[PDB]
Design a protein around this ligand. Structure first.
Ligand code: ANP
Ligand code: ANP
Ligand code: K
Ligand code: K
Ligand code: MG
Ligand code: MG
Lengths: 614, 23, 612
């Protein structure tokens, strides 16, 4: 069933004509005002941007000739009674020809011509936002009437008037009393009157245009009050400025424990600033990137592209980049190659910065780790490439047996002090270092003369098993090492073995004797012990025993096992409770108990009849 | 198999936001 | 002070001119080619849409003529040797005037003009996709040159050739041998040659426009083979093709246990189908394969979540001819229509689950055992109380007044409760065997009030966040006990003084309870439900303690043993007291990681059996 109608039989017959592409301006205005911007409030964000652009242009016109610089400010006025919003700038302005060519032509931007006329592309090319030519028409999203008083900064220009109802036709005229620059009056729509309120305009400006290059006033009072410290050199910004900027961006009243100021240009233009907070991460921090994109000092509002890896969501800051590709809606182009390389560069930069911070201050980095280790663990368990795995794992800090309590150690320094030819890193998980030292697995492991890391946090063995390799050395837990590795009389021991296997057949698939234990009555070993511990939390007792294979081990030298010999015959009934309690204790010590609430009654009725002789 | 299960633990803040009004 | 430069001294004196808006097409083509579509592969989809539109138009023309319906289909050809991709449709076709008017004008679409001549808006308006007029120029994202051989369906129109290199200038000519319809040749760019491979084109076609209303062929073979069953009536669609469609959309191989066909027009045009898989939810499950469609083409928003987060366990598709779209044919983020669609879908799915529970007790019970965690998550993440109660109506629990194995909802629980009673009691335990023997349940065995049993995790949190059902508060058994208002008194006080001395740091307050029969001790806190989960979170993630009141049972043999134990083995008596406190904390669920308890238990047991 493979048939096609594709053929090359067609050919040109008549003389070829020639035509020029046209454009339906009415439908273009409809598209811009209805089906371009998801958020209705961006119209001022464009306009303010335009204002800044104009001012930037004026600065060039006052730098090339080297003359005096008058006041350069942007003004927002709100008239609830008239239902209007006014955006005024003292920038270059626009003449008759400039108003007709720029305002009257869709996708025609005077900024692009201005940038191409710089002949340097180093002063205003990085500070001009307008690049499409449709930003102004977003004003028609909310306005049934746009009224522009524009006059140029040229010595002898005239005030000019520009009315448009947004219906594909606009009128122009000569106006008197117009101040140098451009003042746009927007008459709000019936349903868009909410933009004729002080609070809404203030919210939008603090959402989009806080860090414009020029002072910005709303209804009379300046509302910027905070320069963008991510633009100048890191040496020129102080600790107080860093703290204030962190307080603004993170919406928190504390200070940043870590500050990074990255400024790179060889791979791509990145001016980023990041802060790791002093306070412990909050519950909101764990839930999902807390870093705001900026392009020419205006917000992008991605909120979905994740310019920063998810595990690095605990840091707060900004990223500025003039190279990112923006769509017509002035939003980030999803799944862009440039944004992916930006994310990778930022991730590697932050990993390197954390490594240098660890080298610089041991105690401060130890505090940072005990605060934010869950994020690095999540990054390890969620990464794909082994290089990223190792880079994040270099940030881990686990205290080991070879060092005193409370002295955390890295994986790299642990590997730097192993034996000559052992490619094995051993880790043991316990709630506390005291239990780790007194863990049955560690006591069995004491036969081997090696150093073992101690893990106390949740999802830590899971992190180590996901890492699975560091510095070309395999990661094997103590339980896994015990499994993979290959008093009482013999007759009494064997008969006790048979009795326990008979009375624990359903729950234990194999019982054996371990002479490596000294202070623990019993041990539980599993093939994939680390994987089993995590799987048990994801998915009566025989149900888990089927897929767990709880290999039980007993120590004949322990007091309970020794007393079991007389407890099996004198009162065989209590011996069943005793061995069940020993099995449950070994289960709990192994971490293979979903909830110990079931064994409480068994333990209580063991205690009531165990010490009744007293 | 288990390693690739990538446990979600999503909406992890919502549970604490639920807890807050009770206390 | 305030510094403002806004004034009103300005005035108009000049003559008012009049101009028409212009648009330079070079920058418009540039914007469409680079800064419009995030994905480079969407262009064929647009082309396919165009093809579909053309075919649709032709169909309507034949409806206007009442003549025989010829074969109409979309053919896709891929030439890796020539590095070209061709899309041919047998639609209406375009004349030279039509080619110039439509192809040569930005934002000018013949589909809208055709719709304005429909005068019914139901015959073809539900199937016409083109609405902007820039879809064709997406072909320039990948093409260094585009040819269009178009012959109109009119009886006597000649073929026309349309060349464009995408630099704002295009040429037209008379073409001979062109069959009826439109054949678009695209010569791929140097860096965009991946579209000259059959595999990539097939993947993109199946991803975006697999459910086009007309047959679609790539390199000769047809890959539709499956009609859009979400458009036909629920009675017409059968179970076999229901299973086939579910397997396609969910990329699974099982059958759907629940199938919902929702079709409404009064609030907004919704044609959706939803499936609940037979298998238990996967770890990845915990766009959710509910991808939004519009005029039988994928929107691929992947961010708005048209369906609530907890409703991610269901698969299927949603179609709406009225959802607003970006110029890039993407969903408008945070739109009122989309939010109302999400609310309507959530309400409809809640109603459907309620109806399924009514019409099948055991099947819905199995489904709840399979997907109860999603409803609990929805209750946890919900904000409106009415939504909270609507989702809670889906919860199934087993109570103390009913035999083991059967589950009931909160509605039928409150239907059988006493009129004077105005609260719902719930107790959390891993199994019903532990719940019946739980010290907290035994404490309320004095009263006859029914209590629900919760086994799965996060049920206590779910009932806490719910906090009300049918204007009835939800009070946990522990909370009810704490809010409530053989070891003679002197000996009991003497023993309790020592217990306070040895448990001063841990047990903030200790008292005697008279409602225990089998459990030596109990641990209670005011925020028991909240604390039991806050402790789990704290031991789970290091993010940003409690005052446990301990109650002893005077009639218990273990507690009675402590008087004679203190005078004989004070150290072993202290060990027993610590073990009793640990057991009470474990039963309360407030215990930490119990690995530390094992050592103390063994140190107790080594000497507690030194009497045989
Ligand atoms: N307030 C203003 N003062 C001076 N010139 C302005 C002002 N607003 C707009 N213009 C000019 O009018 C042109 C059209 O505006 P606009 O649509 O914003 O283009 P753009 O801003 O350069 N590109 P975009 O990123 O889409 O906004 C601009 O490029 C400027 O040259
Ligand atoms: N293959 C085709 N056969 C016939 N007419 C076509 C074909 N492709 C395009 N056209 C016509 O040319 C117009 C311009 O194409 P296009 O840019 O896709 O506009 P549109 O599809 O109607 N709106 P949009 O949703 O942005 O694609 C269409 O509206 C059709 O009228
Ligand atoms: K413009
Ligand atoms: K067009
Ligand atoms: Mg602009
Ligand atoms: Mg189209």
């Amino acid at each position: 069933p493979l048939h096609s109608i594709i053929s090359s039989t067609e050919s040109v017959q008549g003389s070829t004509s020639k035509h020029e592409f046209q454009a339906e301006t009415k439908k273009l205005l409809d598209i811009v005002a209805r089906s371009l911007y998801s958020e209705k409030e961006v119209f001022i964000r464009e306009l303010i941007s335009n204002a800044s652009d104009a001012l930037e242009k004026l600065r060039h016109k006052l730098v090339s000739d080297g003359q005096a610089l008058p006041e350069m400010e942007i003004h927002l006025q709100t008239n609830a009674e008239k239902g209007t919003i006014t955006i005024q700038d003292t920038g270059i302005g626009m003449t008759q020809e400039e108003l007709v060519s720029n305002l009257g032509t869709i996708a025609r931007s005077g900024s692009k011509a201005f940038l191409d006329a710089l002949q340097n592309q180093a002063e205003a090319s990085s500070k001009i936002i307008g690049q499409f030519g449709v930003g102004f028409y977003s004003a028609f999203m909310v306005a049934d009437r746009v009224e522009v008083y524009s006059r140029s900064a040229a010595p002898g220009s005239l005030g000019y008037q520009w009315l448009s109802d947004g219906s594909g036709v606009f009128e122009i005229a000569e106006a008197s009393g117009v101040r140098t620059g451009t003042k746009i009056i927007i008459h709000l729509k019936s349903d868009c009157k909410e933009f004729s309120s002080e609070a809404r305009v203030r919210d939008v400006v603090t959402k989009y245009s806080n860090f414009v290059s020029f002072p910005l006033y709303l209804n009379g009072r300046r509302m910027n009050t905070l320069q963008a410290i991510w633009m100048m050199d890191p040496k020129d910004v102080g600790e107080w400025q860093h703290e204030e900027f962190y307080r603004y961006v993170a919406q928190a009243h504390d200070k940043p424990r870590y500050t990074l100021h990255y400024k790179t240009d060889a791979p791509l233009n990145i001016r980023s600033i990041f802060y790791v907070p002093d306070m412990k991460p909050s519950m909101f921090d764990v839930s999902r990137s807390s870093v705001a994109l900026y392009s020419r000092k205006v917000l992008i509002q991605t909120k979905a592209t994740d310019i920063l890896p998810k595990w690095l969501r605990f840091i707060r800051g900004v990223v500025d980049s003039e190279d990112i590709p923006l769509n017509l809606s002035r939003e980030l182009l999803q799944e862009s190659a440039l944004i992916r390389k930006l994310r990778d560069v930022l991730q590697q930069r932050l990993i390197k910065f954390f490594i240098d911070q660890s080298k610089k201050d041991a105690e401060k980095y130890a505090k940072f780790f005990e605060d934010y280790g869950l994020f690095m663990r999540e990054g390890i368990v969620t990464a794909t490439e082994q290089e990223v795995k190792e880079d994040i794992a270099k940030l881990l800090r686990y205290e080991s047996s070879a060092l005193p309590s409370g002295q955390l150690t890295s994986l790299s320094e642990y590997a730097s002090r192993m034996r000559a030819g052992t490619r094995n890193i051993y880790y043991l998980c316990a709630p506390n270092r005291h239990l780790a030292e007194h863990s049955p697995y560690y006591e069995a492991m004491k036969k081997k003369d090696t150093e073992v890391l101690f893990c106390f946090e949740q999802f830590d063995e899971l992190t180590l098993l996901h890492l699975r390799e560091f510095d070309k050395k395999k990661l094997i837990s103590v339980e896994t090492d015990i499994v993979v590795d290959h008093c009482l009389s013999e007759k009494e021991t064997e008969e006790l073995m048979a009795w326990m296997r008979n009375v624990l057949g359903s729950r234990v698939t194999n019982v054996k004797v371990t002479l490596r234990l000294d202070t623990h009555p019993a041990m539980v070993t599993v093939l994939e012990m680390g994987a089993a511990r995590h799987f048990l939390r994801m998915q009566t007792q025989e149900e888990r025993a089927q897929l767990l294979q709880p290999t039980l081990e007993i120590n004949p030298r322990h007091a309970l096992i020794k007393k079991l010999n007389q407890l099996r015959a004198s009162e065989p009934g209590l011996a069943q409770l005793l061995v069940d309690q020993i099995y449950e204790n070994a289960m709990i010590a192994a971490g293979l108990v979903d909830d110990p609430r079931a064994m409480v009654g068994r333990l209580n009725e063991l205690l009531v009849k165990a010490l009744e002789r007293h | 198999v288990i390693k690739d299960l990538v446990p979600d633990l999503s909406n992890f803040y919502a549970q604490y936001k639920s807890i807050e009004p009770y206390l």
